Recover the amino acids of this structure.
């Protein structure tokens, strides 16, 4: 039913605004300059990075760890911290998705374990453009060129996400759209080790309907926007697999690395 | 006018029926012996428990967790699992209380965050009699005696809710009464961190009027039920402070640390 599907859309959007501090609308305002409260410090090379990290004078020290390593590894650690925080926000949002908490508790973990990074790259695009990405709660902007030039492996962890973002952002989705798309990703019946597949697919079918209606009602001039959005779901999967492999590379080229206890669990036995 | 207050009550009752599948009328019929045809499985001890635990799995894999830990901890974890489910139902009901979704987003989160526990205990009384509580949407019935027999910490974690349900159920409230009372509790202007108190009080004032007329009409012979009902909140606030306080001890003296990413994160400045 339309009325129902519209209510679900409205619901997902609300918990989305509640679960994710930096939305696309806000990210865009900062990137476009439209907003007015604090222009982002730009990090595009080694000297601006030092000044950006030590910029800590009027801006206190983020909850993330300090440092005592090289640049590449220090960015890797910042990506981990930030990624761990995202996971906490996505889990909170996942709980508001009608049906999700009613699922077998093991499948709730499985859908989270496999859909988390897919969601992190999808939403990370909201903070990107072809020249860089907003960091530190929209406080800074690290250029694509800088991140791409990091010694060997580290650089390849970044560029892929950018090529994805540039194509994903051409779809022009907004928060209300993304709120439903994210939910479609989490309720994926094809995740490895799911015990009760059908109940999860029935919910996804419902969200898929809500998403289609949402796309037709918010972008009436965008032909097949629904299909082209679902296609990007394959791009996401490639990002994660690629990422998982570069993680294997890093185990051979770096010394004591070790990921955060929460990220280690997600990657334990991951495709 | 009465008519508007009565129309609000009916709106609240209808939303309530949609948000909460197992109503008091339904539960009381099961707790008694109406339409004798599906007497729930009664768990009255450890053997019966495990006998019915794998009985709601003997069919298929969809419990809350299975045998592989201390029974007391496993029952405590099932309570958490169900608690997170109830939160989602309460949230959905909240959205139907006139005025709620128009409040500041942050305040909504805050009202729910502190109100849910008071609501969960209030509503659990509908599923209890002096001797036990209906579980798994009325599929099971676990005896208060058994809940009480759980080792020291866990046992006295359950009994206070039974002590509260007996005294509460003596007020003889029905679903149409409870729908309004629930709404009154959610719209409490004294929760910590509320940004706009005035509007929350204005809404609650209209609900207090609705609840009072409802009680005056539905229970004419129950002298001052309205006042006695408001007074029960002091007992609920107390029950919550106890439960929260007892949660401290549990967090400070236990092994199993695998919980639901809701209640935990939810607790903040929570008395
Ligand atoms: C979600 C990370 C987004 C991100 C950036 O996005 C670029 C693409 C990031 O791709 C990732 C995402 C997650 C990552 C890594 C490396 C490890 N992880 C953690 C994980 O795999 O869960 C790389 C770039 C820089 C930062 C920083 C900074 F280092 F500046 F503090 N924090 O977060 C960044
Ligand atoms: C809402 C709990 C209701 C309840 C029961 O009610 C007894 C009183 C429950 O009191 C509570 C209420 C909330 C609770 C706990 C323990 C943790 N929580 C979550 C929380 O409030 O933080 C205990 C008893 C057993 C179960 C089970 C079973 F273990 F059988 F699967 N599921 O749910 C039960």
């Amino acid at each position: 039913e339309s009325a129902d599907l519209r209510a679900l859309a409205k619901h997902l959007y609300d918990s989305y605004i509640k679960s994710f501090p930096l939305t696309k609308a806000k990210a865009r305002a900062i990137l476009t300059g439209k907003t007015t409260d604090k222009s982002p410090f730009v990090i595009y090379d080694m000297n601006s990075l030092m000044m950006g990290e030590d910029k800590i004078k009027f801006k206190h020290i983020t909850p993330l760890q300090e440092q005592s390593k090289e640049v590449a590894i220090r960015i890797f650690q910042g990506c981990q911290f930030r990624s761990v925080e995202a996971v906490q926000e996505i889990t909170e949002y996942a709980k508001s998705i009608p049906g999700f908490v009613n699922l077998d508790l093991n499948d709730q973990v499985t859908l989270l374990k496999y859909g988390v990074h897919e969601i992190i790259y999808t939403m990370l695009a909201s903070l990107m453009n072809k020249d860089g990405v907003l960091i530190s709660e929209g406080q800074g902007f690290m250029t694509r060129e800088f991140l791409k030039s990091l010694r060997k492996p580290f650089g390849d962890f970044m560029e892929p996400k950018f090529e994805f973002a540039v194509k994903f952002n051409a779809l022009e989705l907004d928060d209300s759209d993304l709120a439903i798309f994210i939910a479609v990703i989490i309720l994926s019946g094809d995740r490895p080790g799911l015990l009760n597949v059908k109940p999860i697919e029935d919910i996804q079918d419902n969200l898929l309907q809500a998403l289609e209606l949402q796309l037709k009602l918010n972008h009436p001039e965008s032909s097949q926007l629904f299909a082209k959005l679902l296609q990007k779901m394959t791009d996401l999967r490639q990002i994660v697999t690629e990422h998982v492999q570069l993680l294997q590379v890093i185990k051979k080229t770096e010394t004591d690395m070790s990921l955060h206890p929460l990220l280690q669990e997600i990657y334990k036995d991951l495709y």
User: Anything to note?
Assistant: The first helix of chain A runs from residue 2 to 19. The radius of gyration of chain A is 19 Å. The first strand of chain A starts at residue 41 and ends at 43. Chain A touches chain B at residues 11, 14, 17-18, 88, 91-92, 95-96, 98, 101-102, 104-105, 195-196 (CB under 8 Å).
